[PDB]
Design a protein around this ligand. Structure first.
Ligand SMILES: Nc1ncnc2c1ncn2[C@@H]1O[C@H](COP(=O)(O)OP(=O)(O)NP(=O)(O)O)[C@@H](O)[C@H]1O
Ligand SMILES: [Mn+2]
Ligand SMILES: [Zn+2]
Length: 346
RNA sequence: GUUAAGUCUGGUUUCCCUCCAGGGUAUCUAAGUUGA
């Protein structure tokens, strides 16, 4: 964790320009002793086994073959018991004096109620406060966020107006800027923390991670690219149907397979057809072309396997989900019938 | 044995509808949340 955060500090210092990287530098130096703590605690449990348990002093044993199914179950038992207490990674930090006594670095705006809460985190206090979208430059510059007019556009590119950030979620934004710093962790033990920063600052590559606006507007984009110029001549002006300037690629397969198809997929729908100053013009444009105006909804599809824990424990609740409860194993003498049937079949 | 003269009456009374069928079958509805 600390190798990643320090490699991030060095990669950001390699870019004292671009505003956002400069703000990241400026607030990292103020929050180290808070950013020392990892944002994600781990639980580690071990289980021991010796030759007293496996061998009759020269060979294997009988009930030695079952020694794994016993130690694995001991391990999972202690995991289950320790999961009875959840401690959150925020409880580890020392903030009493930093909040009671104003000590927090408030680079950005200043709260009129002590400190702000992170909009991305919810619980941690905010370090980088962004003014609301009414007049930014005339504030972003007299405050400490930006230095010029050119650097606001790059700060405003990652931190929307109004986004308060805690050190952890701000570091998350920083990593999201270019997610190639992950090789500090992805490899580890293999290259220096500086080999990688040099490699990244050498071959500059920008990535476009899709927002919920991009997902909601998928079929709209798709229906604009089957009218490549037949819709472009109408606009021809607002960079929606203009050249791919750089060679930006991304992990979104649909974005990656549909980029060189006339329409610039890296526009923000919150700017064009989800905006409040535009989108009437865009309603007209889509009306004039048989374009189904986009819905603001997307699908968050989650899925988890059923009883894979018990399955690794060789239980039968995976096999009979609902019939055999997990609690039915405490005294399995009751449901002898279904287990007998299916186990014998198998 | 003879004379005369016809006169009275001018269809009534019942029954005027009874019984059964008083709707049956088929369709019972089909076809068709979007933007801030
Ligand atoms: N024996 C195991 N080895 C490795 N990972 C495990 C093991 N048991 C659980 N996990 C993972 O650690 C987490 C434990 O969550 P948990 O939900 O209890 O697992 P589970 O077996 O899937 N129970 P459930 O998902 O409710 O059916 C999940 O991310 C599991 O994928
Ligand atoms: Mn699971
Ligand atoms: Zn945060």
């Amino acid at each position: 964790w600390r190798k990643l955060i320090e490699g991030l500090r060095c990669y950001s210092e390699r870019k004292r320009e671009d505003g956002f990287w400069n703000l990241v530098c400026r607030v990292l130096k103020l929050t180290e002793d808070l950013l020392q703590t990892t944002p994600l605690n781990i639980r580690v449990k071990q289980v021991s086994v010796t030759e007293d348990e496996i061998f009759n002093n020269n060979k294997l044993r009988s009930d030695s073959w079952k020694i794994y199914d016993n130690k694995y179950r001991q391990l999972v038992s202690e995991f289950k018991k320790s999961k009875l207490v959840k401690v959150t990674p925020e409880s580890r930090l020392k903030l009493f004096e930093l909040t009671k006594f104003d000590k927090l670095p408030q680079i950005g705006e200043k709260s009129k109620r002590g400190y702000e809460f992170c909009t991305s985190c919810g619980v941690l206090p905010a370090v980088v406060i962004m003014p609301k979208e009414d007049e930014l430059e005339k504030k972003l510059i007299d405050l400490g966020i930006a230095r010029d007019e050119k650097d606001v556009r790059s700060i405003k590119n990652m931190i929307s107006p109004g986004e308060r950030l805690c050190p952890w979620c701000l570091v998350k934004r920083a990593l999201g800027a270019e997610p190639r710093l992950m090789r500090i962790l992805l490899l580890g033990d293999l290259y220096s923390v500086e080999k990688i920063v040099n490699e990244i600052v050498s071959r500059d590559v920008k990535i476009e991670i899709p927002s919920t606006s991009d997902i909601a507007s998928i079929k709209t984009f798709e229906e604009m690219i089957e009218k490549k110029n037949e819709i472009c001549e109408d606009l021809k002006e607002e960079e929606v149907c203009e050249k791919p300037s750089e060679s930006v690629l991304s992990m979104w397969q649909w974005f990656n397979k549909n980029y060189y198809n006339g329409i610039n997929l890296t526009i923000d729908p919150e700017e064009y057809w989800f905006s409040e100053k535009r989108r009437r013009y865009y309603f007209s444009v889509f009306r004039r072309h048989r374009i189904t105006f986009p819905s603001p909804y997307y699908a968050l599809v989650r899925a988890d396997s059923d009883y894979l824990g018990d399955l690794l424990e060789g239980k039968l609740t995976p096999y009979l989900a609902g019939i055999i409860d997990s609690g039915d194993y405490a005294n399995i003498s009751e449901k002898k019938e279904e287990v007998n049937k299916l186990l014998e079949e198998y």
